[PDB]
Nucleic acid binder design. Structure first.
Lengths: 75, 97, 109, 83, 95, 95, 109, 97, 83
DNA sequence: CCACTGGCCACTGGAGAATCCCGGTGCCGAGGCCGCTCAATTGGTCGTAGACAGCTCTAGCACCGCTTAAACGCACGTACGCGCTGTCCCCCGCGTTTTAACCGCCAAGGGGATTACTCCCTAGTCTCCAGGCACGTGTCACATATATACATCCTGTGCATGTAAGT
DNA sequence: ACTTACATGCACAGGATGTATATATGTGACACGTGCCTGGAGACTAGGGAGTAATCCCCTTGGCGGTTAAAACGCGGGGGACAGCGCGTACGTGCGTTTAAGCGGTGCTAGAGCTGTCTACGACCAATTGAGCGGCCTCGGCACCGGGATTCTCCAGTGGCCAGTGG
């Protein structure tokens, strides 16, 4: 079971604080390194990231949808 | 609900059928119309054996179908399954024309 | 008092007419003189080549369970032997069609 | 008597049938006109040679032998019609 | 009555009768076989005549014929044809 | 002691001078030219011989020569060659 | 007693040897007989083609500012003419090189 | 700071150099060594005209270089600038090789 | 007298030069081996034809004109070598 | 905080459909016989083409000694394949309407095909001579080298611009 | 909501380099004169392939009715083409080093090539026939048709799984 993936995505974007947003490939590698079955949950992580953008808790830096770079909010 | 196959499935069935079949795929009479049209462009009142027309037909479709597997290899070479004419010009240029 | 005439094909034990081949070579304008054993050799290698292509055609017909050779059998035989295939790579066959080939990338998942 | 447009007699289903025998899955619409052009260009390339054989034979009727000579001149040898 | 058109039908018919006594033949495929034989004969005599020119020889002999066979025909097919032709030349040598 | 070898050096030299008095040539460029002359000569000769074969013709006349020139030469090269050969036939007819 | 020997190439007003090419045609074994005007016609078309390629080569060498032609000039002449290229698509020139040809997609920006 | 050109700029410079050039790109001595090696496979004790090996040299290099512009056509048709082998056997198979 | 690894004689920058005359600006590291295979296979074809001419010539020294025959028999005509 | 509930995804079975497979059935090419004829065969001859030996000479093979040019290799960087996703629109597919292709039937005559005939040209032979070819020689177009001149490519750098922090 | 400080981007100047260009110089390869001989011209002839005329018939062309299967058109939808973003890696480029190619020189000879001989072989020609081709008749393999089995496709139903939300 384990915790839901939303706070896992927030930890993925919170791991680095690069000056631009984290890319989708980098966060996929982050969940791979921390430990998560990323292969069967591509739809799950994409819906989670899109949901987290739509709440405004995450703001997407450059891309649209699942593409580009994803950074944390202002506060 | 009316039946409908997903795209390409029926198509692949005609690849199976027409690779199984051996006959000419075009209508012979518009073809010989084209032949007489082009022949008139060279000299008048040309008369034709039907077997000559059939030989022209089969040789023409053979050259074309050869261009078709050339175009298929070109399209999958560009990681595509839909053909665009640039494949055919590339095929003609590698073939030397 | 002339002896009984055999044929040069019979003297070579062959099926193709050595005499007709020799006549076509003489009238084919290849040389003004013809060696005796050359049309014999030519008829022999011709009989060989026809033998394997006919054998492959018969095997294809038996696989296609028809007792009569059709040009589709000829195509399927000739394209499946790569030496004979590139031998006749620029040769087009009457009513042969093509080998049944679909690319695996064109095949669905 | 005269003919002005028979290249459109090469119908879209006929082109698609040639594609299926060529094993093509998906065909753009722009394939059709250039395909017609390529095939017809091939046709005058062969039929010029064939007719030149025909008035070479002093004939006004074109035979299959002239076709055979023209095609295997261009290295496109065909069986089933010679003889 | 019309002119005789010489054909290869009966000889290759006999050949198919040794290699497959059971099967039949279609006549237009039989004409395909005739075109095949005429075409490869034309080729092989072509480089044979050219080679006889190159070595400046007035007579077409079997040595350049087998040279022409292994010139056109590939590999094991060529050496097989060499074998049957060689034994046939020995048979006609023994008449 | 040597044996004579035939080439087109004098004739092509005359041609290049009468088209260009000021222009020279290298010897292996002349080898390229000789190979060109022999190549197109053997092409046109084999085609003419096969034309005589198809028409069952014993004698190579200029009709099949001009036919094969029209056959092999692409585009306006063919028409100019036919014109030049016709003119040469005209003077040789008058001579 | 006999007329002075006059050359057939002069009779056609040509440079190529009519007698030589006639002998070549006779000994090339193309037929047992040959008409008189056919080698004349052949010499004319040969002389025309040589004149064309020599004009193009001289133009190339003049553009190269060279008095003496080189097979680089021959390659440039033979490939920059479409009819000559279709004549010799399958023919290679020793030390001719290739055309200076770059794809625009290979260029920067 | 030492001088250094960016990638491609050099590469197009020798592209221009070898296109205007007509001269040989392979060292001839390993070429004759390789020709003698592969000719030993068919027949022993073979001797060689130097001009024969030269004719082999331009014939081989012309064949392969023609395959290279064909490979260029394949790569740009696949929208790339870097070649892979699949370009080469593609071009050969369309050529019938 | 024995030769074993002369396929390595086509050096790596030589292959790069051959690509540059072919107009390639960027080549992979995976190209050299199959180019070696293609060039060698072409070579056994042509030298096989030439040596077939050579024992037909009954010589053990190959000549350039036989090489000319060997190359033209597949239609790869070369000029300037006695052709 | 936890359990109820709703959205999303994968598996699966069933229905439909297209094709493979089994018989029947009439049909027309395959094949086999027959009659004719003309081309292979027999036999002999004569000239000659190439095999065979033998001399010659030349070019290729081998070896070596310097002598750089190039191959290799390493290293560092950046440009490019390429993988993913997102989006848009183009074409497979299926139904409906149309139409002309095809069969087949008949009329007609146009030209290929075949035979006869007589003759224009050309292979062949003899004689003779002249033009091209091997060879020697000389000589200037061009290769090579070196010194200027410009092109061009890359990168620092000053100015313009969008955006975060302070007010 | 306004003003000010900072990262970003972009055009230009300049320098480093590579490529063109001008001029001097040898050199050897191109060009030109020479002897010659063999191959091309002159003249005549045999004869024979071939131009031309006549015929016929058969094979091609044109036209007319019916049919239907194939083509054209429309809807639509999904899946494939393609744009973009990021990312890693893998050649591009530059410098040192090895070494191997290459050029020059020398010696060997074995085999390419020319030359005489002669003889096995192959072209040429009269006789003749039987093998092989044109025509005809029959039939059975096979194309077409009809009915059922099978196998492949697709989609709706259902189970699993995750997350929101309200009690």
């Amino acid at each position: 079971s384990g915790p839901p993936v939303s706070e896992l995505i927030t930890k993925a974007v919170a791991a680095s604080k690069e000056r631009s947003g984290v890319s989708l490939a980098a966060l996929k590698k982050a969940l791979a390194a921390a430990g998560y079955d990323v292969e069967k949950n591509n739809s799950r992580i994409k819906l989670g990231l899109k949901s987290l953008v739509s709440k405004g808790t995450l703001v997407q830096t450059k891309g649209t949808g699942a593409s580009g770079s994803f950074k944390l909010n202002k506060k | 609900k009316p039946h409908r196959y997903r795209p390409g499935t029926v198509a692949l069935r005609e690849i199976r059928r027409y690779q199984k079949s051996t006959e000419l795929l075009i209508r012979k009479l518009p073809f010989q119309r084209l032949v007489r049209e082009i022949a008139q462009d060279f000299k008048t009142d040309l008369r034709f054996q039907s077997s000559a027309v059939m030989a022209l037909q089969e040789a023409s479709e053979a050259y074309l179908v050869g261009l078709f597997e050339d175009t298929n290899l070109a399209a999958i070479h560009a990681k595509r399954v839909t053909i665009m004419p640039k494949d055919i010009q590339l095929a003609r240029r590698i073939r030397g024309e | 008092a002339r002896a009984k005439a055999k044929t040069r094909s019979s003297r070579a034990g062959l099926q193709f007419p050595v005499g007709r081949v020799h006549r076509l070579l003489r009238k084919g304008n290849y040389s003004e003189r013809v060696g005796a054993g050359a049309p014999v050799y030519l008829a022999a290698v011709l009989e060989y080549l026809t033998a394997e292509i006919l054998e492959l055609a018969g095997n294809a017909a038996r696989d296609n369970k028809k007792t009569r050779i059709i040009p589709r059998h000829l195509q399927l035989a000739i394209r499946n032997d790569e030496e004979l295939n590139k031998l006749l790579g620029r040769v087009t066959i009457a009513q042969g069609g093509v080998l049944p080939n679909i690319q695996a990338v064109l095949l669905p998942k | 008597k005269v003919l002005r447009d028979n290249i459109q007699g090469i119908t879209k289903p006929a082109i698609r049938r040639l594609a299926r025998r060529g094993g093509v899955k998906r065909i753009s619409g722009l394939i059709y006109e250039e395909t017609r052009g390529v095939l017809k260009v091939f046709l005058e390339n062969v039929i010029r040679d064939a007719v030149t054989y025909t008035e070479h034979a002093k004939r006004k009727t074109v035979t299959a032998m002239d076709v055979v000579y023209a095609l295997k001149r261009q290295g496109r040898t065909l069986y089933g019609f010679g003889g | 009555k019309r002119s005789r058109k010489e054909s290869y039908s009966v000889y290759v018919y006999k050949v198919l009768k040794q290699v497959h006594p059971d099967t039949g033949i279609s006549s237009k495929a039989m004409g395909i076989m005739n075109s095949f034989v005429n075409d490869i004969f034309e080729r092989i005599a072509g480089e044979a005549s050219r080679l006889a020119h190159y070595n400046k020889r007035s007579t077409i002999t079997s040595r350049e014929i087998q040279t022409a066979v292994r010139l056109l025909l590939p590999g094991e097919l060529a050496k097989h044809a060499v074998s049957e032709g060689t034994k046939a030349v020995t048979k006609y040598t023994s008449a």
